[PDB]
């Protein structure tokens, strides 16, 4: 219709990992590893119509994420809040305008995917190490698959849910 | 839907 966006902000804080989803800057889902039932929950009524299969799916994603976050937190203590923000902006034609993958540690940018969805900006020498690993392993192409595909598709789904 | 980070730093 007009422009729209989806973003997830994932943080693990020493640790309690938290994930919050936004559509058009409005929070719609949430996961916290401090609650009685660490599990994604809808935050707005229009997400409630998603069947139990959905919630189970993304909850499992979240537990896996907790793991990734400890490995990389401890990793970082090696070379608190670990933050991963990602998502997509789409134009009036519903097509991808811009994709984001931004990794930050303790309030400082660590590595982030450039607008080309192909190359990486890193500042730290250490981030230069990561950039190295990921250039070789094809991390940019992997994330680009999400941002150009699933991210757009889920955003349209959530806009319809509303 | 959220995504798997997949890659490690």
């Amino acid at each position, epitope marked *: 219709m007009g422009p729209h966006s989806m973003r997830y902000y994932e943080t693990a804080t020493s640790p309690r990992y938290t994930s919050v989803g936004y559509v058009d800057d409005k929070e719609f889902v949430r996961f916290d590893s401090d609650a009685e039932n660490p599990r994604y929950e809808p935050q707005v009524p229009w997400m409630e119509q998603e069947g139990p299969e959905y919630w189970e799916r993304i909850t499992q994603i979240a537990k896996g994420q907790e793991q990734w976050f400890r490995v990389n937190l401890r990793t970082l203590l090696g070379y608190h809040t670990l933050q991963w923000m990602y998502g997509c902006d789409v134009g009036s034609d519903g097509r991808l305008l811009r994709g984001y993958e931004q990794f930050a540690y303790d309030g400082c940018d660590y590595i982030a995917l450039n607008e080309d969805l192909r190359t990486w900006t890193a500042a730290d020498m250490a981030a230069q190490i990561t950039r190295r690993k990921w250039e070789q392993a*094809g991390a940019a192409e992997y994330y680009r698959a999400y941002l150009e595909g699933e991210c757009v598709e889920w955003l349209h789904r959530y806009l319809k849910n509303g | 839907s959220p995504a798997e980070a997949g*890659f490690f730093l």
Partner: T-cell receptor
Amino acid sequence: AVTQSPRNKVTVTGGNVTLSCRQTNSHNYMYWYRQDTGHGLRLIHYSYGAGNLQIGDVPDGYKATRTTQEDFFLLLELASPSQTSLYFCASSDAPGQLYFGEGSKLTVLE
Amino acid sequence: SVTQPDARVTVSEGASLQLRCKYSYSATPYLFWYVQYPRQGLQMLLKYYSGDPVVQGVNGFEAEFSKSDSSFHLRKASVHWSDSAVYFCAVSAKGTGSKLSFGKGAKLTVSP
């Protein structure tokens, strides 16, 4: 650098067999596959980290345990002849990119 | 699911190779080729996540993603006796990218 043990094993039906796999190179994802002619590799069980177990395509007759990030075990608690196969452990640090151990050939005899 | 159309292929040493692979998922999945030399485990030869459809691998291998045909054929310009091995197409589904499934494999004999 994925190490699996034993590389060779022979057991009788009803036998108890544990296959061990350890990886030093710090990965999260680990996998157990069997390879058989006519079938390629089929995934039995897999894991994203300590304490996580996910069933593969051919879990029946197998249990698995991921006790540490380094260690992934495959248990055949009551071995049957159909479990005669070549078994591979693998680990990964990137979606779909897997590093394989050298294989464990098992024969189950009646 | 990936399908490779022939369980065994023989080529003459020095000749070109194409090993075919089709996938059955609707949404383009993550795609890979692995090789298994005699008596070893498998080793990744190449992969495709997105972008350029022609991907390069180790040892002169390439593969080509075709959205149209849902295929991902492996090619090599000229094969050597030492390329005799089993080659496996593999896939993981979008949204479950770490669950890797293999095809049945193509046993390549290169005749010297």
